[PDB]
Amino acid sequence: VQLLESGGGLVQPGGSLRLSCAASGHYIMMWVRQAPGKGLEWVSGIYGGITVYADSVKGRFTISRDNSKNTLYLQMNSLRAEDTAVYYCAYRRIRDEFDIWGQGTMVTVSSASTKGPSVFPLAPSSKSTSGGTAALGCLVKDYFPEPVTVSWNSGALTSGVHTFPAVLQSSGLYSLSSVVTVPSSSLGTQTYICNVNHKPSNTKVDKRVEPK
Amino acid sequence: DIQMTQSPSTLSASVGDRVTITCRASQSISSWLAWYQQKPGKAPKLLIYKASTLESGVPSRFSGSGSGTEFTLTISSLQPDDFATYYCQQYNTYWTFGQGTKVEIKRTVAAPSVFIFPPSDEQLKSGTASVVCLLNNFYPREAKVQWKVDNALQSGNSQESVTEQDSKDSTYSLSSTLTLSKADYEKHKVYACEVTHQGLSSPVTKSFNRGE
Ligand SMILES: [Cl-]
């Protein structure tokens, strides 16, 4: 068995999408979703063609199947920010496998447009210098959509580097910082440059982070 | 209406340890309980169904026990592949998932090194000020960050982000970002980040004076 999912994408609030999950190779079929940072959430099922819904989506989503196409659908109307999630389909036996899961399709509900990040220095100073070690970094702010990547010194500095998971701001744009700890002794010797790439906007930025 | 609650929410363990996760139902679900494993970025994988039946191809170190309202997943000897998040699911009435239990790698206590970064003059020209507080390479994950602006405690104007456990040293790092308009930022002098953590015998504060 394989389940092939599609139909996920970016849509503005109030918009609609139709997800598909096509089987290859008795049933109960489910849709289950996972918002960023959150747990699994069952949202709809079809078992006669009996259909059921979670309270969170009832009245907005509709589950159906086309037996001739071996394909399960989820029609999603009146979408909201909180519907942003990865949507999985799962087939449950009613092979020796009890479950078959799809790989997921991403749904993003937002009116933001593609936008490259700002890149601001996080300069080392006495306020970021503890016992021979200094911290420095770059703040990669106000981009859409995910993802960005950050390197240091074009990949030459990897030790001590932490690039944080993005947060969604109330503006609807993403932000993250990337930081590195180095010897405070290296601050006048060695140069530190963050290399930021945001493929969706064709943005590639190099920023030198100079010590105070 | 069937609520599923797991305990603990996070468990810290070592390779070779025997580990137990509990799942409770708000009303009896008889033996209609499944356990899942999920890794970051991936569809969940079924481990156990009908409370105690091992799914095809799942390692024999996983086992499930219990019935009615109380269930247990046991991993007899933990392996590196097993650090992950685990979800129970009731399927008495539709599907409902528990909130997840994260199994992470135990190590010694390590206090965070704390660093504060004022906003760049460069950003201030944007009309916004981001003040960044970094907590680096600490364990365990639980920590508290308070922002204080001229000794006044702040709320609702910050966002946190945390890394996944480091693959070499098993620590976490955390960023907290305070965001203010330029005008609001210019009203105050002293900006401080106060950090509480098990490894610190008292809270650590890093601070600066705007412009100094
Ligand atoms: Cl659920």
Numbering used by the authors:
A (entry chain H): 2 to 26, 31 to 52, 55 to 101, 106 to 223
B (entry chain L): 1 to 212
Quote the authors verbatim.
Plasma kallikrein (pKal) proteolytically cleaves high molecular weight kininogen to generate the potent vasodilator and the pro-inflammatory peptide, bradykinin. pKal activity is tightly regulated in healthy individuals by the serpin C1-inhibitor, but individuals with hereditary angioedema (HAE) are deficient in C1-inhibitor and consequently exhibit excessive bradykinin generation that in turn causes debilitating and potentially fatal swelling attacks. To develop a potential therapeutic agent for HAE and other pKal-mediated disorders, we used phage display to discover a fully human IgG1 monoclonal antibody (DX-2930) against pKal. In vitro experiments demonstrated that DX-2930 potently inhibits active pKal (Ki = 0.120 ± 0.005 nm) but does not target either the zymogen (prekallikrein) or any other serine protease tested. Here, we describe the discovery and biochemical characterization of DX-2930, including the x-ray structure of the Fab·pKal complex, which provides a rationale for the specificity and effectiveness of DX-2930.
To understand the interaction between DX-2930 and pKal with atomic resolution, we crystallized the Fab portion of DX-2930 both alone and in a complex with a deglycosylated variant of the human pKal catalytic domain.
